Protein backbone atom coordinates (compact mmCIF):
# COMPACT_ATOMS: atom_id res chain seq x y z
CA UNK A 1 0.00 0.00 0.00
CA UNK A 2 1.32 3.33 -1.24
CA UNK A 3 1.37 6.71 0.53
CA UNK A 4 2.08 9.92 -1.40
CA UNK A 5 3.78 11.55 1.61
CA UNK A 6 4.47 10.70 5.27
CA UNK A 7 1.50 12.74 6.39
CA UNK A 8 -0.88 10.34 4.67
CA UNK A 9 0.90 7.36 6.23
CA UNK A 10 0.47 9.18 9.53
CA UNK A 11 -3.26 9.34 9.19
CA UNK A 12 -3.20 5.65 8.46
CA UNK A 13 -1.09 5.00 11.55
CA UNK A 14 -3.41 7.14 13.69
CA UNK A 15 -6.65 5.65 12.34
CA UNK A 16 -5.42 2.07 12.79
CA UNK A 17 -4.81 2.74 16.47
CA UNK A 18 -7.98 4.77 17.00
CA UNK A 19 -10.22 1.95 15.75
CA UNK A 20 -10.83 0.12 19.10
CA UNK A 21 -12.05 3.25 20.87
CA UNK A 22 -13.94 4.44 17.78
CA UNK A 23 -15.81 1.18 17.28
CA UNK A 24 -16.59 0.84 20.97
CA UNK A 25 -17.69 4.39 21.93
CA UNK A 26 -19.62 5.39 18.76
CA UNK A 27 -20.29 2.34 16.59
CA UNK A 28 -21.48 0.18 19.46
CA UNK A 29 -18.67 -2.46 19.20
CA UNK A 30 -19.83 -3.71 15.81
CA UNK A 31 -16.70 -4.33 13.72
CA UNK A 32 -17.89 -6.41 10.77
CA UNK A 33 -16.71 -4.74 7.55
CA UNK A 34 -17.32 -6.41 4.21
CA UNK A 35 -17.47 -9.76 6.01
CA UNK A 36 -14.18 -9.36 7.88
CA UNK A 37 -13.24 -8.48 11.45
CA UNK A 38 -11.30 -5.36 12.12
CA UNK A 39 -11.36 -4.97 15.89
CA UNK A 40 -8.67 -6.57 17.98
CA UNK A 41 -12.96 -11.94 24.14
CA UNK A 42 -9.70 -13.43 22.90
CA UNK A 43 -11.42 -15.61 20.33
CA UNK A 44 -9.78 -12.93 18.21
CA UNK A 45 -6.89 -15.38 18.27
CA UNK A 46 -8.96 -17.10 15.64
CA UNK A 47 -10.94 -14.64 13.48
CA UNK A 48 -8.79 -11.50 12.97
CA UNK A 49 -6.58 -11.21 9.89
CA UNK A 50 -4.37 -8.17 10.33
CA UNK A 51 -3.36 -7.64 6.74
CA UNK A 52 -7.05 -7.74 5.77
CA UNK A 53 -8.03 -5.30 8.48
CA UNK A 54 -5.19 -3.07 7.32
CA UNK A 55 -6.03 -3.14 3.60
CA UNK A 56 -9.63 -2.29 4.39
CA UNK A 57 -8.78 0.76 6.46
CA UNK A 58 -6.34 1.81 3.68
CA UNK A 59 -9.27 1.49 1.39
CA UNK A 60 -11.23 3.86 3.55
CA UNK A 61 -8.44 6.48 3.79
CA UNK A 62 -8.08 6.42 -0.02
CA UNK A 63 -11.82 6.90 -0.33
CA UNK A 64 -11.81 10.01 1.84
CA UNK A 65 -8.58 11.49 0.52
CA UNK A 66 -6.66 10.82 3.73
CA UNK A 67 -8.60 13.54 5.52
CA UNK A 68 -8.61 12.04 8.99
CA UNK A 69 -11.67 13.48 10.64
CA UNK A 70 -13.72 12.71 7.52
CA UNK A 71 -12.48 9.12 7.48
CA UNK A 72 -13.57 8.29 11.02
CA UNK A 73 -16.94 10.00 10.62
CA UNK A 74 -17.75 7.77 7.61
CA UNK A 75 -16.25 4.70 9.22
CA UNK A 76 -18.88 5.33 11.92
CA UNK A 77 -21.65 5.83 9.39
CA UNK A 78 -20.67 2.60 7.62
CA UNK A 79 -20.42 0.37 10.69
CA UNK A 80 -23.64 1.73 12.21
CA UNK A 81 -25.51 1.15 8.95
CA UNK A 82 -24.10 -2.39 8.86
CA UNK A 83 -25.82 -2.95 12.23
CA UNK A 84 -29.10 -1.14 11.74
CA UNK A 85 -29.65 -2.24 8.17
CA UNK A 86 -28.41 -5.85 8.02
CA UNK A 87 -26.37 -6.23 4.80
CA UNK A 88 -25.03 -9.68 5.71
CA UNK A 89 -28.59 -10.85 6.34
CA UNK A 90 -29.91 -9.46 3.04
CA UNK A 91 -27.57 -11.89 1.24
CA UNK A 92 -27.56 -15.05 3.38
CA UNK A 93 -30.87 -15.17 5.29
CA UNK A 94 -33.70 -13.15 3.77
CA UNK A 95 -36.08 -14.37 1.10
CA UNK A 96 -36.43 -12.28 -2.04
CA UNK A 97 -39.11 -12.10 -4.70
CA UNK A 98 -38.41 -14.93 -7.12
CA UNK A 99 -38.46 -13.00 -10.40
CA UNK A 100 -35.73 -10.83 -8.82
CA UNK A 101 -33.25 -13.64 -8.08
CA UNK A 102 -33.46 -14.60 -11.75
CA UNK A 103 -32.09 -11.23 -12.86
CA UNK A 104 -29.11 -11.24 -10.50
CA UNK A 105 -26.15 -13.23 -11.84
CA UNK A 106 -22.79 -13.55 -10.08
CA UNK A 107 -19.67 -14.87 -11.85
CA UNK A 108 -16.00 -15.29 -11.06
CA UNK A 109 -13.06 -15.88 -13.43
CA UNK A 110 -9.99 -17.06 -11.54
CA UNK A 111 -7.85 -16.11 -14.54
CA UNK A 112 -9.44 -12.80 -15.45
CA UNK A 113 -7.92 -9.38 -15.77
CA UNK A 114 -7.14 -7.46 -12.58
CA UNK A 115 -10.28 -6.41 -10.73
CA UNK A 116 -12.46 -7.90 -13.40
CA UNK A 117 -12.47 -11.44 -11.96
CA UNK A 118 -15.49 -10.88 -9.67
CA UNK A 119 -18.47 -9.53 -11.64
CA UNK A 120 -22.12 -9.08 -10.75
CA UNK A 121 -24.81 -8.76 -13.37
CA UNK A 122 -28.27 -7.22 -13.24
CA UNK A 123 -30.57 -8.29 -16.06
CA UNK A 124 -32.72 -5.25 -15.49
CA UNK A 125 -33.97 -5.14 -19.09
CA UNK A 126 -35.95 -8.30 -18.33
CA UNK A 127 -38.01 -6.32 -15.75
CA UNK A 128 -39.68 -3.69 -17.98
CA UNK A 129 -42.41 -6.35 -18.07
CA UNK A 130 -42.94 -6.09 -14.33
CA UNK A 131 -43.11 -2.62 -12.78
CA UNK A 132 -44.58 -3.85 -9.49
CA UNK A 133 -41.17 -4.95 -8.19
CA UNK A 134 -40.44 -1.23 -8.04
CA UNK A 135 -43.42 -0.13 -5.93
CA UNK A 136 -42.06 -1.85 -2.81
CA UNK A 137 -38.79 0.02 -2.84
CA UNK A 138 -37.40 -1.27 0.44
CA UNK A 139 -37.68 -4.91 -0.48
CA UNK A 140 -35.90 -4.31 -3.78
CA UNK A 141 -33.03 -2.44 -2.09
CA UNK A 142 -32.74 -5.35 0.29
CA UNK A 143 -32.58 -7.78 -2.64
CA UNK A 144 -29.80 -5.79 -4.41
CA UNK A 145 -27.66 -5.13 -1.35
CA UNK A 146 -27.88 -8.89 -1.06
CA UNK A 147 -26.25 -9.28 -4.44
CA UNK A 148 -23.68 -6.61 -3.57
CA UNK A 149 -22.58 -8.47 -0.46
CA UNK A 150 -22.44 -11.88 -2.19
CA UNK A 151 -20.17 -10.30 -4.80
CA UNK A 152 -17.65 -9.20 -2.19
CA UNK A 153 -17.45 -12.68 -0.74
CA UNK A 154 -15.44 -13.38 -3.91
CA UNK A 155 -12.78 -10.75 -3.37
CA UNK A 156 -9.30 -11.18 -1.88
CA UNK A 157 -8.74 -7.87 -0.16
CA UNK A 158 -5.05 -8.68 0.36
CA UNK A 159 -4.51 -8.95 -3.38
CA UNK A 160 -3.71 -6.29 -5.95
CA UNK A 161 -5.63 -8.01 -8.78
CA UNK A 162 -8.83 -8.97 -6.88
CA UNK A 163 -9.64 -6.25 -4.32
CA UNK A 164 -12.32 -4.55 -6.43
CA UNK A 165 -15.45 -5.67 -8.27
CA UNK A 166 -16.91 -5.19 -11.73
CA UNK A 167 -20.60 -4.85 -12.52
CA UNK A 168 -22.73 -5.16 -15.65
CA UNK A 169 -26.24 -3.94 -16.27
CA UNK A 170 -28.04 -5.46 -19.20
CA UNK A 171 -30.82 -3.19 -20.27
CA UNK A 172 -31.72 -5.20 -23.36
CA UNK A 173 -35.35 -4.42 -23.78
CA UNK A 174 -35.90 -1.08 -22.09
CA UNK A 175 -38.50 1.12 -23.71
CA UNK A 176 -37.89 4.84 -23.67
CA UNK A 177 -41.52 5.42 -22.68
CA UNK A 178 -41.53 3.22 -19.57
CA UNK A 179 -39.13 5.21 -17.43
CA UNK A 180 -41.44 6.15 -14.58
CA UNK A 181 -40.49 7.54 -11.15
CA UNK A 182 -40.75 4.06 -9.61
CA UNK A 183 -37.53 3.08 -11.36
CA UNK A 184 -36.00 6.47 -10.63
CA UNK A 185 -36.67 5.85 -6.93
CA UNK A 186 -35.03 2.42 -6.64
CA UNK A 187 -31.99 3.59 -8.66
CA UNK A 188 -31.39 6.67 -6.56
CA UNK A 189 -31.87 4.72 -3.32
CA UNK A 190 -29.45 1.90 -4.08
CA UNK A 191 -27.04 4.43 -5.62
CA UNK A 192 -26.98 6.40 -2.36
CA UNK A 193 -26.06 3.29 -0.46
CA UNK A 194 -23.24 2.23 -2.80
CA UNK A 195 -21.93 5.81 -2.70
CA UNK A 196 -22.24 6.33 1.07
CA UNK A 197 -21.40 2.82 2.33
CA UNK A 198 -19.55 0.91 -0.26
CA UNK A 199 -16.77 3.28 -1.45
CA UNK A 200 -13.58 2.06 -3.11
CA UNK A 201 -15.05 -1.28 -4.19
CA UNK A 202 -15.97 -0.70 -7.87
CA UNK A 203 -13.34 -0.96 -10.61
CA UNK A 204 -15.50 -0.81 -13.77
CA UNK A 205 -19.23 -0.81 -14.46
CA UNK A 206 -20.64 -1.59 -17.94
CA UNK A 207 -24.12 -0.64 -19.12
CA UNK A 208 -24.82 -2.74 -22.20
CA UNK A 209 -27.60 -2.96 -24.79
CA UNK A 210 -28.61 0.70 -24.27
CA UNK A 211 -30.02 2.60 -27.28
CA UNK A 212 -28.70 6.20 -27.81
CA UNK A 213 -32.21 7.62 -27.34
CA UNK A 214 -31.44 7.00 -23.65
CA UNK A 215 -28.82 9.73 -23.32
CA UNK A 216 -31.08 11.84 -21.13
CA UNK A 217 -31.51 8.97 -18.70
CA UNK A 218 -27.75 8.48 -18.40
CA UNK A 219 -27.20 12.17 -17.94
CA UNK A 220 -29.82 12.50 -15.20
CA UNK A 221 -28.76 9.43 -13.20
CA UNK A 222 -25.03 10.34 -13.28
CA UNK A 223 -25.80 13.45 -11.23
CA UNK A 224 -26.20 11.10 -8.23
CA UNK A 225 -22.65 9.61 -8.33
CA UNK A 226 -19.25 11.12 -7.71
CA UNK A 227 -16.59 11.82 -10.36
CA UNK A 228 -14.53 8.97 -8.94
CA UNK A 229 -17.05 6.32 -9.73
CA UNK A 230 -18.39 8.15 -12.81
CA UNK A 231 -14.98 7.76 -14.45
CA UNK A 232 -15.48 3.97 -14.15
CA UNK A 233 -18.70 3.99 -16.21
CA UNK A 234 -18.87 2.61 -19.79
CA UNK A 235 -22.04 2.52 -21.94
CA UNK A 236 -22.34 -0.03 -24.76
CA UNK A 237 -25.16 0.18 -27.27
CA UNK A 238 -24.14 -3.29 -28.66
CA UNK A 239 -23.93 -5.92 -25.90
CA UNK A 240 -21.83 -8.29 -28.02
CA UNK A 241 -18.88 -5.92 -27.65
CA UNK A 242 -18.71 -6.75 -23.96
CA UNK A 243 -15.98 -9.34 -24.46
CA UNK A 244 -13.68 -6.55 -25.61
CA UNK A 245 -13.70 -5.56 -21.92
CA UNK A 246 -14.50 -8.78 -19.97
CA UNK A 247 -12.23 -11.36 -21.53
CA UNK A 248 -14.02 -14.48 -20.25
CA UNK A 249 -17.68 -13.48 -20.27
CA UNK A 250 -19.99 -15.74 -22.29
CA UNK A 251 -19.64 -15.76 -26.08
CA UNK A 252 -23.42 -15.71 -26.36
CA UNK A 253 -24.68 -12.16 -25.83
CA UNK A 254 -21.52 -10.80 -24.53
CA UNK A 255 -19.05 -11.56 -27.30
CA UNK A 256 -16.71 -13.12 -24.75
CA UNK A 257 -14.30 -16.07 -25.06
CA UNK A 258 -16.19 -18.77 -23.08
CA UNK A 259 -18.20 -20.52 -25.84
CA UNK A 260 -18.96 -23.50 -23.58
CA UNK A 261 -21.50 -21.97 -21.22
CA UNK A 262 -23.68 -18.86 -21.40
CA UNK A 263 -24.28 -16.42 -18.52
CA UNK A 264 -26.85 -18.70 -16.81
CA UNK A 265 -24.49 -21.63 -16.81
CA UNK A 266 -21.66 -19.38 -15.59
CA UNK A 267 -23.46 -18.36 -12.38
CA UNK A 268 -22.17 -19.08 -8.88
CA UNK A 269 -24.74 -20.59 -6.47
CA UNK A 270 -22.60 -21.86 -3.60
CA UNK A 271 -22.25 -18.44 -1.94
CA UNK A 272 -21.27 -19.31 1.58
CA UNK A 273 -20.59 -16.28 3.88
CA UNK A 274 -17.11 -15.43 5.02
CA UNK A 275 -15.83 -16.95 8.23
CA UNK A 276 -16.44 -13.91 10.40
CA UNK A 277 -19.59 -13.20 8.44
CA UNK A 278 -21.08 -16.48 9.60
CA UNK A 279 -20.14 -15.90 13.24
CA UNK A 280 -21.83 -12.47 13.22
CA UNK A 281 -24.95 -13.90 11.61
CA UNK A 282 -25.46 -16.93 13.87
CA UNK A 283 -24.54 -15.04 17.06
CA UNK A 284 -27.23 -12.58 15.96
CA UNK A 285 -29.92 -15.29 16.00
CA UNK A 286 -29.49 -16.32 19.65
CA UNK A 287 -30.22 -12.80 20.97
CA UNK A 288 -33.46 -12.52 19.03
C1 LIG B 1 -35.66 1.31 -17.27
C2 LIG B 1 -35.08 0.32 -16.63
C3 LIG B 1 -33.95 0.56 -15.60
C4 LIG B 1 -33.90 0.09 -14.35
C5 LIG B 1 -34.94 -0.78 -13.60
C6 LIG B 1 -32.67 0.53 -13.77
C7 LIG B 1 -32.25 0.23 -12.51
C8 LIG B 1 -31.15 0.75 -11.90
C9 LIG B 1 -30.78 0.56 -10.50
C10 LIG B 1 -31.62 -0.29 -9.53
C11 LIG B 1 -29.61 1.21 -10.33
C12 LIG B 1 -28.73 1.46 -9.09
C13 LIG B 1 -27.84 0.34 -8.60
C14 LIG B 1 -27.76 -0.88 -9.43
O1 LIG B 1 -28.81 -1.60 -9.36
O2 LIG B 1 -26.60 -1.40 -9.34
C15 LIG B 1 -29.27 1.83 -11.57
C16 LIG B 1 -28.17 2.63 -11.73
C17 LIG B 1 -27.77 3.23 -12.89
N1 LIG B 1 -28.38 3.15 -14.11
FE1 LIG B 1 -30.14 2.12 -14.47
N2 LIG B 1 -31.98 1.27 -14.71
C18 LIG B 1 -32.73 1.32 -15.86
C19 LIG B 1 -32.36 1.94 -17.03
C20 LIG B 1 -31.19 2.63 -17.30
C21 LIG B 1 -30.78 3.30 -18.56
C22 LIG B 1 -31.59 3.35 -19.88
C23 LIG B 1 -29.56 3.86 -18.36
C24 LIG B 1 -28.72 4.65 -19.41
C25 LIG B 1 -27.39 4.45 -19.54
C26 LIG B 1 -29.15 3.57 -17.00
C27 LIG B 1 -27.97 3.97 -16.39
C28 LIG B 1 -27.63 3.85 -15.07
C29 LIG B 1 -26.48 4.43 -14.43
C30 LIG B 1 -25.36 5.29 -15.03
C31 LIG B 1 -26.59 4.02 -12.96
C32 LIG B 1 -25.66 4.27 -11.76
C33 LIG B 1 -24.97 2.94 -11.45
C34 LIG B 1 -23.97 3.18 -10.35
O3 LIG B 1 -23.94 4.34 -9.83
O4 LIG B 1 -23.39 2.17 -9.83
N3 LIG B 1 -30.18 2.85 -16.43
N4 LIG B 1 -30.22 1.55 -12.51
Author numbering: 1 to 40, 45 to 292
The authors write:
We report Sfh5 is a novel penta-coordinate high spin Fe3+ heme-binding protein conserved across the fungal kingdom that exhibits unusual heme-binding properties. As such, Sfh5 is the founding member of a new and conserved class of fungal hemoproteins, and provides the first demonstration that the spectrum of ligands for PITP-like proteins extends beyond lipids. In contrast to the known priming lipids of other Sec14-like PITPs, heme is not an exchangeable ligand for Sfh5, and the feeble PtdIns-exchange activity of Sfh5 is strongly enhanced in heme-binding mutants – indicating Sfh5 is not designed to function as a bona fide PITP in vivo. While the biological functions of Sfh5 remain to be determined, chemogenomic analyses forecast Sfh5 plays a role in organic oxidant-induced stress responses.
The crystal asymmetric unit (ASU) contained three molecules of Sfh5 with a single heme-Fe bound to each of the chains. Sfh5 adopted a typical Sec14-fold comprised of eight α-helices, five β-strands, five short 310 helices and a β-hairpin turn. By contrast, the Sfh5 helical gate was shifted by ~18 Å across the cavity opening relative to the position of this substructure in Sec14 -- thereby describing a ‘closed’ Sfh5 conformer. Again, in a strategy conserved across the Sec14-like PITP family, Sfh5 residue F228, located at the C-terminus of the KKFV gating element (KPFL in Sec14 and Sfh1), engaged K192 of the adjacent helix A6 in a cation-π interaction to stabilize the closed conformer. Only ~8 Å2 of the heme surface area was solvent exposed -- as opposed to 835 Å2 for free heme. In that configuration, heme b exhibited twenty-five van der Waals interactions with amino acid side chains of the residues that line the cavity, including residues F138, F144, V178, I187, I195, F211, V212, F218, I225, V229, and F237. Bound heme-Fe was in close proximity (2.3 Å) to the hydroxyl group of residue Y175, and tyrosine coordination was consistent with the results of safranin T dye-reduction assays which estimated an unusually low thermodynamic reduction potential for Sfh5 heme (−330 ± 3 mV vs normal hydrogen electrode). The Y175 hydroxyl group also engaged the Nε2-tautomer of the proximal H173 via a hydrogen bond interaction. Only two amino acid side chains (S191 and I225) reside within a 5 Å radius on the distal side of the Fe -- reporting the absence of a sixth coordinating ligand and establishing that bound Fe is penta-coordinate. That vacant coordination site on the distal side of the Fe represents a candidate substrate binding pocket positioned close to the Sfh5 protein surface and to which access from solvent is occluded by the side chains of K188 and K192 of helix A6 on one side and residues L224, I225 of helix A7 and F228 on the loop connecting helix A7 and 310-helix T4, on the other.
